[PDB]
Design a binder for this molecule. Sequence first.
Ligand SMILES: Cc1cc2nc3c(=O)[nH]c(=O)nc-3n(C[C@H](O)[C@H](O)[C@H](O)COP(=O)(O)OP(=O)(O)OC[C@H]3O[C@@H](n4cnc5c(N)ncnc54)[C@H](O)[C@@H]3O)c2cc1C
Ligand SMILES: Cc1cc2nc3c(=O)[nH]c(=O)nc-3n(C[C@H](O)[C@H](O)[C@H](O)COP(=O)(O)OP(=O)(O)OC[C@H]3O[C@@H](n4cnc5c(N)ncnc54)[C@H](O)[C@@H]3O)c2cc1C
Lengths: 401, 401
Amino acid sequence: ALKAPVVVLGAGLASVSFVAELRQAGYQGLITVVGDEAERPYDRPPLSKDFMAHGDAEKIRLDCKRAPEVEWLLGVTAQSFDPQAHTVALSDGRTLPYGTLVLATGAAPRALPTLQGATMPVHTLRTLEDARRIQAGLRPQSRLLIVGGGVIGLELAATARTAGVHVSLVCTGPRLMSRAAPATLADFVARYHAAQGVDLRFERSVTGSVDGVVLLDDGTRIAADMVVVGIGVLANDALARAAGLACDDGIFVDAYGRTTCPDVYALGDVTRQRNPLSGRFERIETWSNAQNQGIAVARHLVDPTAPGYAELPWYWSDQGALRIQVAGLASGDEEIVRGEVSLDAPKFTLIELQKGRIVGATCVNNARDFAPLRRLLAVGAKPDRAALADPATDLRKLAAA
Amino acid sequence: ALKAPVVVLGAGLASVSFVAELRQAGYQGLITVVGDEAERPYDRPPLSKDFMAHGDAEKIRLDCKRAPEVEWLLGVTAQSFDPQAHTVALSDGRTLPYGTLVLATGAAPRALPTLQGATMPVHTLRTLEDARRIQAGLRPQSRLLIVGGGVIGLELAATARTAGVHVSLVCTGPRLMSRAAPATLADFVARYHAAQGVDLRFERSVTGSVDGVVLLDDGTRIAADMVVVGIGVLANDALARAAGLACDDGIFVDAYGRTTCPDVYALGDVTRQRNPLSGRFERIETWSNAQNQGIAVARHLVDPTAPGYAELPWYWSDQGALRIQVAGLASGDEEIVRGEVSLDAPKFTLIELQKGRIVGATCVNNARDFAPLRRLLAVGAKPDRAALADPATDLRKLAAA
Ligand SMILES: Cc1cc2nc3c(=O)[nH]c(=O)nc-3n(C[C@H](O)[C@H](O)[C@H](O)COP(=O)(O)OP(=O)(O)OC[C@H]3O[C@@H](n4cnc5c(N)ncnc54)[C@H](O)[C@@H]3O)c2cc1C
Ligand SMILES: Cc1cc2nc3c(=O)[nH]c(=O)nc-3n(C[C@H](O)[C@H](O)[C@H](O)COP(=O)(O)OP(=O)(O)OC[C@H]3O[C@@H](n4cnc5c(N)ncnc54)[C@H](O)[C@@H]3O)c2cc1C
């Protein structure tokens, strides 16, 4: 079952979390990790936040201390694996044997086909190298265009505005943060960015570019010194596809992290997996999933009596003065708003319910509310709705009961 | 790998096809099939066609001759399996051991929530028992309402009209056959059924029913003596879900039929699998898939050097005077129409292309065209488009080259 030696492809958060948990749970056999980036393993959330602002990569490294006795092959690409021979072929000419193979290869930014032949700077934001490249162009008074309405682009927008960069943004949908965010939150976030000087363009798509100017499908133009494309990511599942595993923009896994190929597991951004709230398969693109799924899969490999992965989804986003936290589903049949939604010292909580049951929550500048809401969410609590709205109501009280 | 004994859950076409191929390929170990219906294994397409018209079940049985030495446990339900103990628990109190387990449990009609408490006859059409029940109510001059725009309901509509039954049909979408059928075909099919006296209602949903009358979301009413609901099917994947396999309205499998649980395979209507034309996972609800996937999975189990399942999708439908055949994708960036589309002796062919490459085809009353088109489709042919349209062009010529 858990058969030595263990080989992990990818050296991001999911991989680090997984191998640390293998060691902590008591597995003492060989562990080898193959990472294509020639970088000490690092966390990605800082890249559009404090790193983009302050540039010190030695503040963003992952702690591999809880993963002793691991050989990290950095700057090496796994090119294929043979699931019958139980081997992995590396770009440096070597081959690794495995008893258990774990695919933790993440996802890469989608390219925008209409900007393929662009003759102006066009970047995406995924890696430390990407971040350094973009930062090297955040000249004060320069003009940045962001393509996409997702959180990473908005975090970059906020960082850029703080640095004195003019920012425009084009969004194909009618609202920002179309994925996994309540409409009430999305509408407020737009109001915030607009108030901070971001030039927002909704329901627009990029049709091309000419001599430093981007073209839109309404027949208009946006000049910029740099374009950062952030229209989502695609799973890095090429090795899995070639080896015959079930994949569809993501490697299908069950709650034990098993793929359709025996002795091969997958975790993190590369996986398509069950969302227990919706009961549907989804590719879950969050820090908490990478860590939590990695830990759960490792724990169950060492101890088969352990339950499968069961954590509910959540993420956070730091956008200027907004500290955003979102858990569970974006919507249900009811939203309860705790507090006022205002640009004057923003602070509020949203709760989404389905037939009385909490299925999601949002906190903006209220971390203290978020933890008890996540616990209520976890057991599908059906609290008193007026109490949920009432500001006199304390939420940590409810969760404890 | 192929480990004896083999146990198959379900005794439909996929199961029969699979076990016959195991035997033909040379596997001589135990095979036991568990089938919940107390019926000699039978084919479903006749149920909305000649059986509905003529009633002889001994014309619709599957040939189990190519599957010698198989014990068929008919009228028995598999209630669970334990993938660690390698056992299956049966409704009759017995337990079966397995080396290889194959889930071939098909799919069941979706219920219509708004008709849940109906006090008038409401049926679905999946089984021989369903067909006999519906047929027992096809009184000449009676009124039948069909809910859904799919092929099975339309086949029933045609059968009913031929039998002198008044037929009305409510479709939530703007067109019939929304799944896997070109719009040109769907529009023609509506014209045909309307000409045969079917009362078609598009963009309408059922909101409920009262004392023999069905209510619609436009505030109107349709009286009927019987309602047949045909709004699609849901995979019978409950055993897989309970046992920890990756599922989402269908058991995920790769081209070898492997699930995420070692030693457990799945085939047929119950599976969610790669469509090689779209490159996306889909639940493929066709006779040809059930047979072809069953055969391919069996062949590769006995001979691991055999390729995985690779057949492209296709189906047929018999609707009164229309003998419809459809292969591949419903659309691309071009449709070529061979012949005229007319209610006067209907006979035409559609070809769908994507950047010059054939990705789909349709034949109405032209079986001779369909086989060569499927071969051209299979190798992604890029034929001369004017020739494809030209009636002087023979298609069997093209395929042979
Ligand atoms: C800029 C940015 C900001 C983010 N902010 C937040 C946030 O505030 N909150 C939040 O919840 N989430 C955030 N995320 C999301 C989060 O960081 C991801 O969910 C997480 O990185 C996924 O981890 P992973 O280990 O699955 O994948 P990855 O981090 O992508 O790691 C995979 C690694 O495998 C490598 N690899 C791929 N193929 C091969 C191969 N064949 N051989 C060897 N190596 C290979 C990759 O190049 C990569 O280094 C952010 C992400 C980015 C990019
Ligand atoms: C009325 C009708 C007309 C059709 N016409 C056409 C057509 O003209 N062309 C076409 O391409 N396709 C047609 N089809 C589709 C086609 O018949 C299906 O694709 C095919 O039946 C799928 O085969 P299967 O073996 O995967 O599933 P099934 O035929 O559903 O067989 C599965 C069996 O497993 C049983 N089972 C489920 N759970 C358990 C359990 N726990 N224990 C034991 N047994 C269990 C089921 O009850 C069932 O008997 C038609 C289907 C119907 C219903």
